[PDB]
Design a protein around this nucleic acid. Structure first.
Lengths: 133, 31, 43, 122, 791, 28, 119, 67, 130
RNA sequence: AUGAUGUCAUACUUAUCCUGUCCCUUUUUUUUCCA
């Protein structure tokens, strides 16, 4: 509807002004722990490919992109802030499931560069929400 | 700035001489 | 990631020959190009 | 200064496991927030299932020890000599068991089961 | 050379005449180029300036009073009123602070949003942040915050003379070894005017010899007593020790004047400085007639400015009938210094010492970083007491030695206890340097591994066991190819003996030599070569020319410098706009010696105001005069410092990169947190901004303004290239004919260019290019066209 | 580790050390 | 009520007056200027940006071209009497003092453009 | 920041694909995103605000200065 | 509704800033009463006056030539901490918590040791067997 | 009518070759201020 969402929006504004919340800004170009947040995002991304199996071409492509961002952090940070400024069109996502024999749970499939961008972005916003509590 | 005006100090140093401490090249047990 | 005009003409000829549903058959022709990249570059 | 004997007895006590306070990457581990729900959406991102979604070997530490269980599990089997009587040990003619140590391509199929280590186990 | 000093004095009066002419030009240029509302604005501004001036002077005068009944009540009232003022201004600032601290959502902006300013405490605080983060994640409690109720609280019933301190201070002063010999000391001082006084360490010579002159009354007529030192830190150590020997605070009769620390309140008897201020009031004073008797620091440090000072002291001995000058000395190598001053007498002082048996290895080895580890494990299994000092020769191997020794320490648990090992560097923050000076724990056998800092400058407490391999790097410069090779050399026998003196400075020494006693006695060096035969004189040829000497290679010295260094310095000065066809300094040649930077860096100033851009290249000339190297990249971390340095990178060489470093450090509060998070040493570039302040101050004497071209950095590089014409290269140096190699720490390590200048020619492993900048050899041909031919 | 044994026994709960601490607090 | 709703330059001058007010409160609580309104003796010009090559009676006579000075007193050093480039010229009238301040400011006397304002 | 919020909005407006299944997600959420855990916790937080109410939520959290 | 909430946040911030300014004025009045209490409480001397005159003339000299005023601003207390520790003999306090290096990095690792599901890659035993 | 000319990709040649680098020390002058 309209007025229910408007009332929830107004109550959200009221609680946000009640909690004195300084808002999370855009990520700065020279952040003090952007390297360390990229290290944590690289840990999160390299958690999946820790098996060192035969893989396939897309998995080896993603591992090569991971090692490219591992070698050059600064170009990756500039590209991430560039996509956060500019990129509002993204690739399509694949989908699949696994069966747990009582229900099915989906697994999505995103482009690896967008995965790296969303992982580092997730790390930055999680530390930002920690800092602002 | 000219060519022979940068060599009058070298001519004066050649007329004065060369000291063993002025560029003491370390060399011993030469053969 | 780059797209040469030779690759674009190869992709167009492979679509006009193989239809639209066949994409791994097209990606066999297009060297270092996955079927998702071929489908995204076409559509 | 804090000596070794101050926290030596309580080295692996505590839920965050006191030895974790002297970790290598613990300074850059001050920035990971919501890693529990990162694992709980990594179950939505990864097709295999993680049983250890509820713990962390770096944050929470390692929470058990099974090597004494291995030692008493060996001891409950009637001894190493009793095990080697069951196995093919005496045909090898080693003087002792203590020297023993265990250990870009294209193919038509690659997902075949390896018969060799099951054969050598047999 | 008394006429040399007279001509130097005449140069001082024509320098004062040139200063007066520039002053006359300054007031010539100055002369050539609603009334009650005006009264009200004048009074608002004047009361604002008076309010801030009294507010600035208030706690400054409370600090001045605290440095020294009704005065105590007025001091209590003054402390209370500045307390109420600071909480009043903090209350206004706090009202503004939660005026700011609101929700305040971000505005939707047309286009890109605008970035605003920020923060917290950066250096070290994140470790305690993680510690109490784990503590908050582990500790837990239940109930509300009002949960302390229902407590009965059963208690236990249980069962029913500063004058003596001053006299101890003179007893301490009586306990010196120079106190039983102070009568013979002043007897020989009154006997001879050129006296060399040698003595072993522990004698307290530098803190008692000006004292023993001070009861001798040589400082009687207002001609004060000075104390020069090779280092400012040693100068402040002697100044503080003498200052607390009499209780006379700094600024007063025990005062000092070093670079960026000139605390003299015009009452100073005992003045404390280094050799560069003896150079500066030789450049402002023709002869020390305002100094009666001045002690001389040791020649074993072998500072080039102190060797020039030795030549000036011999010229003073020729000029004055006497000054009763006296040279404090450490070791027994005073025969040449005796014969330099016309058979100068030498008085020895016995030093209180220890059994410092020099050991040996019964094997030759070429490793010296694992045999010493085996030896220090043998030290840890023999007798416990004693700190361990181990010498090495470089940062890049001493951090690897620290890493492997820490791995060997962490390989064992209760066995091998403590053994904290700390290294010493030059491009280093001083916090862990202070942690070196922190005393050892009683269960510890603390190791300070070191380079030549502990050999030459540093004496640390409690050290007994010292491992010495006797090797240090030397900056040997060969002008045959013009190449400045930094190469590791074996050290001297006297160097090993002063390292043994460092071993036995505290207790019974354990100087373990890392080679044979035969190689120590025979194969090792016995005399260190000085700096003049190892390097050039490019900073001091201009200064010795401007201080009245034209017979530079005929000037009296202990040993002459190599003539090729003087010839290349003079031909470089010909290529500079400093010398005429007759080889004499111009007005610009005199004015570039007003400021003590190199002339190769003074063509920065000579290209300044040619087409301006003066402020940028003056900042650059300030910050490239640093002694310690910039940027702090430790063992581990690596990538964070590299990413900060890459963020600092700009194209056009590393001078613009570090210019951006200093520019963004400006308007950053000049904080330690900035240099911590940007991985910069907060000791050397603070001295660089102090050099920038001093060179801003020393600009009216050369009459150059602080103009800037406001981001015309290609023209700034044009002035930089106008300075740097001799140090240029095409993959090959066009002058030295040497194949170039780019340093990995340079900003242009990749993308090898067609034309690059450089600043420095240090060989470490390859023919390295240090501090490069991109050029095209267009304006390079503009500057020194006599030097330049055939592209 | 008898030294660590007696160090733990001296840095333990130690009711007699608590009585010394409270008796000195009462006397002071 | 709220003080909001004024002009931007009005808020700027009220905040500048607030800062001057807090400086006046600061001087009053410190006690160097213990009076309330804090005002100088009127018809007394403070002379600054001076030079050590002039005279006080000559400066009063020079300032007398736009209104005569009754007396002069240079605030020199308290011990040596060195030229501190600060003077107090007590004129006969406030308008005469203001006209002398408007007619002697930026006057290069002894190679120094001296200025006159309120005391 | 509004560009970050536009990135959040455009991230979920992508096409779900499985072989010959192709349809754009526009009103569901995607749990494959890395920040999806954060925005589900934020959504559950504003559901806690809706259910508990702002006064009782302030009584939960205490003051924002001393949580 | 977003524009209305923007206006509501603006007027609420105006109200909160106005009452904060009112409380600041109340604190200014109460601490001005404390300043009048200070005024009621206030109701080598030549060497100290000479030092004050020298400091005032040095302050006016720094006003004439703008720089760091000698050892009070170029050095101050925020000088190089090496010569603050040594050239000034006064020491400082010790913050933080001190440990041993032999206990300091036995635990390490870049991530947690559960590589995904981590099922068929062994790693069930913490230490070695023998 | 076939030339000049752009770093555009592809082709080919060479029994071409399978690839290297982060400094021990160290000192350097001079000018104003409100009841």
């Amino acid at each position: 509807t309209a007025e229910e969402a408007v009332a929830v929006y107004t109550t959200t504004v009221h609680w946000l002004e009640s909690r004195r919340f300084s808002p999370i800004p855009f990520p700065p170009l020279s952040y003090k722990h952007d390297t360390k947040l990229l290290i944590l995002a690289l840990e999160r991304l390299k958690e999946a490919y820790s098996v060192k199996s035969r893989l396939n071409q897309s998995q080896r492509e993603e591992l090569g992109l991971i090692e490219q961002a591992y070698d050059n952090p600064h170009e990756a940070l500039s590209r991430i802030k560039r996509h956060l400024l500019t990129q509002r069109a993204f690739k399509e996502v694949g989908i699949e499931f696994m069966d747990l024999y009582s229900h099915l749970v989906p697994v999505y499939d995103v482009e690896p560069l967008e995965k790296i961008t969303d992982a580092y972005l997730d790390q930055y916003l999680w530390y930002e929400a920690d800092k602002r509590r | 700035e000219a060519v022979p005006v940068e060599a009058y100090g070298l001519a004066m140093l050649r007329g004065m001489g060369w000291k063993p401490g002025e560029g003491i090249g370390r060399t011993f047990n030469q053969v | 990631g780059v797209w040469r005009n030779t690759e674009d003409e190869i992709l167009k000829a492979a679509v006009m020959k193989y239809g639209k549903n066949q994409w791994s058959r097209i990606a066999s022709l297009l060297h270092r190009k996955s079927a998702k990249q071929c489908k995204a570059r076409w559509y | 200064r804090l000596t070794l004997e101050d926290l030596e007895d309580s080295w692996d006590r505590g839920i965050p496991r006191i030895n974790t306070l002297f970790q290598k990457d613990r300074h850059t581990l001050a920035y990971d927030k919501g890693w529990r729900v990162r694992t709980d959406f990594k179950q939505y991102q990864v097709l295999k299932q993680n049983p250890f979604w509820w713990t962390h070997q770096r944050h929470d530490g390692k929470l058990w020890n099974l090597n004494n269980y291995r030692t008493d599990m060996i001891q409950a089997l009637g001894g190493v000599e009793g095990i080697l009587e069951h196995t093919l040990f005496k045909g090898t003619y080693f003087p002792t068991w203590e020297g023993l140590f265990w250990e870009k391509l294209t193919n038509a199929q690659r997902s075949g089961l390896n018969q060799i280590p099951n054969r050598r186990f047999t | 050379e008394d006429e040399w000093e007279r001509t130097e004095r005449e140069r001082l009066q024509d320098l004062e005449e040139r200063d007066a002419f520039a002053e006359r030009v300054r007031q010539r240029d100055k002369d050539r180029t609603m009334v009650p509302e005006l009264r009200k604005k004048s009074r608002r501004e004047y009361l604002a300036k008076r309010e801030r001036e009294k507010l600035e002077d208030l706690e400054a005068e409370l600090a001045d009073e605290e440095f020294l009944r009704h005065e105590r009540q007025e001091l209590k009232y003054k402390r209370r009123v500045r307390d109420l003022a600071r909480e009043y201004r903090a209350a206004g600032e706090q009202e503004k602070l939660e005026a700011t601290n609101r929700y305040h959502m971000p505005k939707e902006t047309r286009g890109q949003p605008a970035r605003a300013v920020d923060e917290s405490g950066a250096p070290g605080e994140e470790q305690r942040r993680w510690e109490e983060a784990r503590l908050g994640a582990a500790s837990l409690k239940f109930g509300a915050r009002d949960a302390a109720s229902q407590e009965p609280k059963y208690q236990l019933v249980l069962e029913e003379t500063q004058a003596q301190q001053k006299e101890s201070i003179q007893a301490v002063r009586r306990s010196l070894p120079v106190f039983p010999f102070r009568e013979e000391l002043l007897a020989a001082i009154a006997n001879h005017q050129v006296l060399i006084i040698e003595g072993e360490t522990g004698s307290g010579k530098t803190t008692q010899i000006p004292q023993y002159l001070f009861e001798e009354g040589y400082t009687n007529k207002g001609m004060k007593i000075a104390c020069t030192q090779p280092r400012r830190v040693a100068a402040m150590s002697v100044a503080a020790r003498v200052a607390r020997e009499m209780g006379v605070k700094l600024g007063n009769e025990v005062g000092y004047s070093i670079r960026f620390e000139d605390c003299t309140s015009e009452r100073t008897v005992l003045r404390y400085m280094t050799d560069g201020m003896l150079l500066r009031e030789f450049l402002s004073e023709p002869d020390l007639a305002s100094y009666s008797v001045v002690m001389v620091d040791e020649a074993h440090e072998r500072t080039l400015h102190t060797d020039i000072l030795f030549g000036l002291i011999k010229d003073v001995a020729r000029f004055r009938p006497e000054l009763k000058v006296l040279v404090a000395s450490a070791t027994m190598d005073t025969a040449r210094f005796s014969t330099f001053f016309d058979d100068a007498p030498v008085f020895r002082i016995p030093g209180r010492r220890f059994p410092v048996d020099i050991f040996y290895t019964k094997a030759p080895e070429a490793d010296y970083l694992e045999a010493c580890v085996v030896s220090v494990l043998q030290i840890h299994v023999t007798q416990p007491p004693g700190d361990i000092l181990v010498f090495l020769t470089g940062q890049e191997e001493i951090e690897a030695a620290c890493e492997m020794l820490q791995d060997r320490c962490r390989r064992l648990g209760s066995k091998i206890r403590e053994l904290l090992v700390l290294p010493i560097y030059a491009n280093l923050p001083s916090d862990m340097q202070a942690r070196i000076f922190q005393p050892t724990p009683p269960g510890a056998r603390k190791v300070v591994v070191a380079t030549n800092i502990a050999e030459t400058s540093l004496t640390i407490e409690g050290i007994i066991y010292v491992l010495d391999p006797g090797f240090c790097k030397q900056k040997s410069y060969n002008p045959r190819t013009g190449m400045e090779s930094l190469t590791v050399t074996p050290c001297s026998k006297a160097s090993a003996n002063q390292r043994a003196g460092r071993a036995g400075r505290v207790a019974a020494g354990k100087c373990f030599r890392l080679y044979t006693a035969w190689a120590y006695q025979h194969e090792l060096e016995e005399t260190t070569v000085p700096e003049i035969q190892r390097t050039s004189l490019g900073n001091v040829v201009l200064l010795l020319k401007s201080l009245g000497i034209h017979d530079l290679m005929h000037f009296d010295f202990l040993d002459p410098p190599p003539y090729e260094t003087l010839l290349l310095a003079l031909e470089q000065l010909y290529a500079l706009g400093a010398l005429n066809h007759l080889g004499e300094l111009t007005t610009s040649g005199r004015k570039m010696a007003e400021l003590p930077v190199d002339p190769m860096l003074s063509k920065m100033i000579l290209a300044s105001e040619k087409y301006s851009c003066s402020e940028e290249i003056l900042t650059v000339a300030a910050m490239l005069s640093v002694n310690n190297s910039i940027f702090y990249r430790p063992k581990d971390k690596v990538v964070h410092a590299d990413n900060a340095r890459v963020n600092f990178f700009l194209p056009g060489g590393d001078h613009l990169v570090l210019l951006n470093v200093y520019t963004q450090w400006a308007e950053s509060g000049y904080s330690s947190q900035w240099c911590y998070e940007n991985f910069v040493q907060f000791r050397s570039m603070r001295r660089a901004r102090d050099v920038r302040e001093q060179l801003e101050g020393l600009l009216e004497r050369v009459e150059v303004g602080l103009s800037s071209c406001q981001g015309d950095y290609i023209r700034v590089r044009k002035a930089i290239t106008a300075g740097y014409f001799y140090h240029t290269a095409r993959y090959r140096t066009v002058k030295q004919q040497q194949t170039v190699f780019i340093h990995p720490n340079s900003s242009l390590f990749e993308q090898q260019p067609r034309w690059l200048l450089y600043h420095e020619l240090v060989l470490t492993t390859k023919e390295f290019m240090r501090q490069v900048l991109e050029i095209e050899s267009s304006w390079l041909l503009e500057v020194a066209p006599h030097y330049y031919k055939a592209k | 580790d008898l030294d660590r044994m007696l160090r733990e026994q001296e840095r333990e709960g130690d009711p007699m050390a608590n009585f010394i601490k409270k008796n000195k607090a009462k006397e002071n | 009520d709220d003080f909001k709703g004024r002009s931007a330059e009005e808020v700027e001058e009220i905040k500048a007056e607030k800062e001057a007010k807090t400086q006046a409160i600061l001087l009053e609580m410190v006690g160097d200027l213990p009076d309330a309104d804090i005002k100088p003796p009127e018809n007394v010009l403070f002379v600054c940006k001076l030079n050590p090559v002039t005279t006080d009676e000559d400066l009063e006579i020079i300032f007398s071209r736009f209104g005569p000075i009754r007396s002069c007193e240079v605030i020199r050093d308290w011990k040596t009497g060195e030229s501190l480039c600060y003077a107090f010229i007590e004129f006969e009238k406030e308008e005469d003092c203001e006209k002398a301040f408007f007619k002697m400011d930026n006057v290069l006397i002894d190679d120094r453009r001296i200025h006159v304002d309120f005391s | 920041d509004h560009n970050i919020a536009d990135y959040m909005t455009a991230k979920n407006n992508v096409v779900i694909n499985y072989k010959d299944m192709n349809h754009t997600n526009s009103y569901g959420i995607i749990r494959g995103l890395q920040f999806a855990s954060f925005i589900v916790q934020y959504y559950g937080l504003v559901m806690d605000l809706l259910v508990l109410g702002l006064h009782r939520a302030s009584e939960m959290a205490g003051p924002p200065q001393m949580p | 509704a977003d524009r209305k909430a923007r206006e509501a946040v603006e007027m609420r911030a105006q109200v909160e800033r106005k009452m904060a300014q009112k409380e600041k004025e109340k604190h200014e009045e109460k601490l001005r009463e404390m300043a009048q209490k200070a005024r009621e409480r206030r109701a080598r001397d030549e060497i100290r006056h000479d030092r004050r005159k020298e400091r005032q003339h040095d302050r006016n000299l720094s006003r004439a030539a703008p720089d760091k005023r000698s050892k009070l601003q170029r050095n101050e207390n925020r000088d190089i901490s090496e010569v603050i520790a040594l050239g000034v003999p006064n020491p400082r306090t010790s913050n933080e918590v001190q440990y041993d290096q032999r206990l300091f990095n036995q635990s390490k690792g870049m991530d947690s040791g559960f590589a995904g599901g981590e099922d068929e890659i062994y790693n069930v035993y913490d230490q070695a067997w023998r």
